[PDB]
Design a binder for this molecule. Structure first.
Ligand SMILES: *C[C@H](COC(=O)CCCCCCCCCCCCCCC)OC(=O)CCCCCCCCCCCC
Lengths: 218, 403, 393, 218
């Protein structure tokens, strides 16, 4: 309903091997629940996350949003669609190591309505809700490696995040307190949240979502 | 050492903004060194034209006496005056008469010289296709006229001249204007401001107008040296008369040499500043490159080579970039320099506005010659500045391996 | 913090702990522009001071734009000075000039004479020596020569010289009858300028009788200008009734066109300096985009448009240009200002002798504005390429 | 008959926030005796290679070399030891892009030799030793990643080797050639004694050889 996936593949030079990802897939996003699709990697699955977002024109593929197509809009039109409603973390430590962690969290807040009293106030408590209040003003460079990822998780969540398409909540973890982020998304769903598409490359301790799929190299 | 640096440059052909990171530095060096070369060539051309168009026709110095007009061959001997330093000498008559022809007129300083003495003394040919100097004798009492003056009077090779001549009298009979018109003998072209003042008459015939006998004023020098003029012109006493102060070639036209040298220094400093800015550009690209290839610098450390080689690698990288830029610039400068006068004439025709005014400037055209030592100096200074810029990334190339 | 996305650019300016702010790579463009503007303002101001020194020398002692009638000499009754207030002038005074030739007992010379009234003051007055012009009453046929003119002509004081006006008669079948009347010298004026040798002072009435003008009419009125260099603009003006507006552009003018061309040539060289600085600008941003092409991916999905991020790199280069232009102009004007007063004496090296300087504020402001425009227009290419696609995230 | 043990340990520069690596390190490399370590280096064990071999100064304790502690010498002196005796592969990715493989393998000998003529000859004979004569004179990026490690090992042993701190010798190639490198490495042992200390995390060949140790936290 929310997002309807279609045949998506990656193209290379015509003379060489194009290395197509997939050519027969059709998946839909239910408003309220989520999917989980992971199989054998090594064919652009990590980059396939970026394909869902409004980044690159699909090769013989297309995606649609609520009531209107997403691949048939201008760049300016795309901006509002993925600003206040759609956010997602990445594979590596992409958290812009130039600003402050408060600014990184509030970065998409700043791109929008100017409620500076609310913008600073929400981020401190919301990051604390993730489990980081003290030392929050520190730069990301001077921070724990595993703590780098959890900050991005808060960044991926906004005022009204309609959908998230991230796929790596795991990685640099601690296995003692890092388990909290698993239930944080569910807690928002348990507190009237939105669809949270998320699934890790390792199914162990990660199949706890609504439904479990596999990835194909067609 | 050269292998790593050279393949680093040519290697980065994919990614890294090849058309915005290296060609820009090449263009910077090119314009810098090219315009500096053109400027130095123009200055050398100015020196050559000043030597062959002013120094060869202006008397190298003057001798004057506040007493009666006769100085040598009547009261003294110019042969006594000849001392080591002077190539030759010949007496000259300073005879200002001025010319008016009704609606046309200009100011001239008529000068009386023997044709053989001037031919042997200084290179002042008639400078015209007529080549009437051999006919210019103490015969029909012909008069030489400058081009600008002849243009003003609208006169030509053969016609009478409305020359005005004064008279002298020891406070007995004054203000009796007189005029004599004999002939005109060609033009005297220098393509400079001197063409509007000079007018020559045979000395023997000139003595026939200024009513005296065997009496000639001073102005008799021709000097093998062209810079020591101010010093050894102090050769008075050999003719006695007055020795307080005598005019020399310094002062009247000595400011031209000072101006030429000063322009050279100003242009050199400004273009060195240009090369310094382009060196800022190249040091920026060097620090960016060393930041990009940090992994390779790490593995080369893992495989032997000490601190020196990497420094040498990046110094050679920067020096190669600067050398390519300087070579392109210098070849452009050389090809444009040897055709400087044609291109200046071309742009003048296109613009339709004369760049150099013949009224105030002494050239009327832009000369140029190449010395092939200025080029060597250009490459030396460009490469030195490039190495100086490259020094800093070399030091910031000894980074510890990240992993 | 500022909903203009300039926060990102400003933080890029300051940079992280190990960024280019302290590595002299972000401000390298700034210092390049600073040196370029330094050369521009300093050299242009000094050479403009040279030009202004000629303004006071060969124009501050010379007739400027005499107002003469179309038919010929202007009768003062027909067009009185009471109604010739043209905008742009300073004041007015009657004058008469013309080309004449001077012959003494020994030598001959040519010059232009000044038919001025001693009643009014003369810009040559503070340069006379042992002479007061009030003796220039009508009838005596008096005249005052110049020091160089006197030396060329030999006469010093009390001698009698003749003036020949070429533009007179020359029609009688007796060959020629030029207007010639004897005058006697009284003294010299010793202004340290090249106006000497062709400038002499005569009474107005004597000038009128010299040139055969009917009645006591005058050729025209001397028209002072506060900024005589821009006189060509004043050329197009509503001249009362029929008259010409003949200027110094005919006697002089070639020299001033030459000095203006010299000004333009020096400007071209120093503009080559600033253009090399501008070329340096684009590469620094090109590096600043090719690196951080990783962090653009983070922002790109976060919501801001390509136009939003096209500005943060645009202001990145521009802010470097802004600081460099202002700092160069302000510090550069300081160098010129102190190069005449409290000037570190270096006159032995160059020509020296108290290098004149004229800092014209309009000239400095335009150069700073152009440096702003050149720096900003350069940054377009790195900014435009900064938002193309999503490569190698 | 050589210690190689000094109870050395490594920690972060600060030590108050960032964690450290395993403590009380006890190598016993001694003479040219082959070893193998499979103690799950994925959890983080490459820091010893940053110390073992003089890559980085250790915070505590040193390493006893053949006859003198290399830690107590200038970096210029240290680099000479690394070039002449030690052979590294590690996971620097050993990539010299735009640099041909034939010269790439000869690079450690290309740091200065008595006669440049025979430097190339040593490169070819190692290429045939690993079986890489085909497609030798072309860019490594053009060549597939399967032979990427094949040329990588040759660069480690092209110089006369005595210490080889090999990491991941298998690569991502077939088990036939993956096991055959032991025959290839064994051939160099026939020529003269040369150490082959391997730190990996793959248990297929953990028991494949003798003198195998394991240390992840102790
Ligand atoms: C006396 C000189 C003459 O004016 C010139 O030299 C004009 C420059 C042209 C010379 C170049 C000859 C070839 C023409 C083309 C060359 C390249 C053209 C490029 C086109 C894009 O004028 C002056 O020098 C007056 C200026 C006085 C300043 C000197 C010192 C002042 C400052 C001293 C201290 C500063 C730190």
């Amino acid at each position: 309903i929310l997002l309807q996936c279609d045949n998506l593949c990656k193209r290379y030079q015509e003379g060489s091997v194009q290395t197509d990802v997939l050519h027969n897939v059709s998946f839909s996003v239910g408003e309220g629940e989520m999917m989980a699709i992971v199989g054998s990697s090594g064919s652009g699955k990590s980059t396939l996350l970026h394909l869902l977002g409004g980044l690159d024109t699909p090769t013989s593929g297309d995606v649609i949003f609520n009531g209107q197509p997403m691949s048939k809009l201008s760049s300016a039109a795309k901006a509002e669609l993925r600003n206040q409603k759609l956010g997602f973390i990445y594979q590596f430590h992409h958290l812009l190591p130039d600003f402050t962690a408060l600014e990184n969290v509030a970065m998409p807040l700043l791109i929008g309505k100017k409620k500076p009293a609310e913008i600073n106030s929400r981020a401190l408590e919301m990051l604390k809700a993730v489990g980081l209040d003290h030392r929050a003003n520190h730069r990301p460079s001077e921070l724990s490696g595993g703590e780098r990822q959890r900050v991005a998780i808060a960044r991926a969540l906004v005022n009204n995040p309609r959908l998230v398409l991230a796929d790596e909540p795991t990685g640099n973890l601690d296995a003692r307190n890092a388990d909290s982020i698993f239930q944080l998304l569910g807690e928002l769903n348990r507190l009237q949240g939105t669809a949270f598409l998320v699934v890790t490359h390792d199914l162990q301790l990660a199949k706890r979502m609504s439904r479990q799929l596999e990835m194909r190299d067609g | 050492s050269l292998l790593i640096g050279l393949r680093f440059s040519r290697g980065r052909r994919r990614g890294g903004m090849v058309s915005l990171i290296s060609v820009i530095s090449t263009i910077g060096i090119a314009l810098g060194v090219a315009v500096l070369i053109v400027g130095l060539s123009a200055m050398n051309g100015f020196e050559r034209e000043l030597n062959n168009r002013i120094l060869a026709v202006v008397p190298h110095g003057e001798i004057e006496a506040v007493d009666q007009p006769w100085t040598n061959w009547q009261e003294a001997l110019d042969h006594v005056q000849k001392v080591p330093g002077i190539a030759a000498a010949a007496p000259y008559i300073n005879f200002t008469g001025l010319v008016e022809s009704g609606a046309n007129l200009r100011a001239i300083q008529v000068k009386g010289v023997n044709p053989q003495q001037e031919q042997r003394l200084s290179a002042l040919p008639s400078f015209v296709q007529g080549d009437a100097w051999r006919n210019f004798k103490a015969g029909e009492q012909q008069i030489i006229i400058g081009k600008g003056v002849a243009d003003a009077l609208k006169v030509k090779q053969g016609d009478w001249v409305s020359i005005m001549i004064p008279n002298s009298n020891p406070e007995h009979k004054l203000m009796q204007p007189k005029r004599v018109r004999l002939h005109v003998a060609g033009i005297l072209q220098l393509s400079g401001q001197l063409d509007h003042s000079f007018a020559m008459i045979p000395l023997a015939d000139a003595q026939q107008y200024l009513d005296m006998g065997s009496s000639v004023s001073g102005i008799a020098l021709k000097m093998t040296d062209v810079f020591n003029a101010n010093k050894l012109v102090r050769d008075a006493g050999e003719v006695t008369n007055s020795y307080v102060y005598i005019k020399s070639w310094i002062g009247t036209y000595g400011y031209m040499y000072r101006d030429i040298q000063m322009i050279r220094a100003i242009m050199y400093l400004a273009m060195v500043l240009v090369i310094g800015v382009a060196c800022f550009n190249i040091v920026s690209t060097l620090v960016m490159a060393v930041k990009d290839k940090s992994g390779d610098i790490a593995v080369l450390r893992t495989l032997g080579a000490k601190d020196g080689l990497i420094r040498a690698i990046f110094v050679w990288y920067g020096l190669l970039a600067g050398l390519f830029g300087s070579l392109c610039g210098v070849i452009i400068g050389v090809v444009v320099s040897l055709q400087l006068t044609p291109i200046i004439e071309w742009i003048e025709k296109l613009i339709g506005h004369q760049f150099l005014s013949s009224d105030i400037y002494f050239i009327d055209f832009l000369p140029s010659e190449l010395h092939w030592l200025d080029v060597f100096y250009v490459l030396v200074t460009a490469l030195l500045l490039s190495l100086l810029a490259s020094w800093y990334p070399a030091r910031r190339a000894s980074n510890i391996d990240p992993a | 913090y500022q909903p203009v996305a300039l926060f990102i650019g400003l933080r890029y300016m300051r940079g992280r702990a190990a960024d280019r702010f302290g590595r002299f790579v972000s401000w390298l463009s700034t210092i390049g522009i600073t040196l370029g503007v330094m050369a521009l303002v300093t050299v242009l101001s000094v050479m403009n001071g040279f030009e202004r020194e000629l303004q006071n020398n060969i124009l501050g002692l010379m007739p400027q734009a005499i107002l003469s009638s179309e038919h010929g000499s202007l009768n003062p009754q027909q067009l009185p000075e009471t109604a010739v207030k043209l905008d742009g002038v300073n004041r007015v005074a009657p004058i008469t000039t013309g080309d004449v030739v001077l012959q003494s007992a020994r030598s001959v010379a040519v010059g232009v004479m000044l038919g001025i009234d001693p009643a009014q003051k003369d810009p040559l007055t503070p340069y006379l020596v042992n002479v007061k012009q009030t003796d220039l009453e009508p009838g005596k046929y008096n005249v005052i020569l110049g020091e160089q003119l006197a030396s060329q002509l030999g006469v010093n004081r009390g001698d009698q010289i003749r003036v020949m006006v070429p533009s007179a008669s020359q029609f009688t079948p007796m060959g020629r009858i030029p207007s010639q009347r004897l005058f006697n010298v009284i003294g010299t004026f010793a202004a340290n300028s090249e106006v000497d040798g062709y400038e002499m002072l005569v009474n107005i009435e004597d000038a009128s009788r010299l040139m055969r003008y009917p009645a006591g009419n005058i050729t025209g009125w001397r028209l002072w200008l506060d900024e005589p260099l821009k006189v060509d603009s004043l050329s197009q003006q509503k001249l009362p009734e029929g008259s010409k507006w003949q200027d110094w552009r005919d006697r002089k003018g070639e020299l001033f066109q030459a000095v203006r061309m010299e000004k333009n040539m020096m400007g071209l060289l120093l503009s080559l300096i600033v253009a090399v600085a501008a070329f340096n600008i684009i590469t620094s941003l090109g590096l600043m985009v090719m690196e951080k092409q990783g962090e653009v991916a983070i922002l790109q999905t976060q919501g801001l448009t390509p136009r939003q991020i096209m500005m943060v790199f645009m202001v990145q280069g521009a802010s470097a240009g802004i600081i460099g232009a202002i700092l160069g102009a302000a510090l550069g004007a300081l160098l010129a200002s102190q190069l005449n007063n409290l000037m570190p004496i270096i006159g032995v090296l160059l020509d020296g002798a108290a290098l004149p300087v004229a800092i014209e504020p309009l000239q400095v402001i335009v150069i700073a504005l152009v440096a702003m425009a050149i720096a900003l227009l350069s940054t377009l290419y790195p900014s435009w390429r900064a938002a193309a696609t999503q490569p190698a995230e």
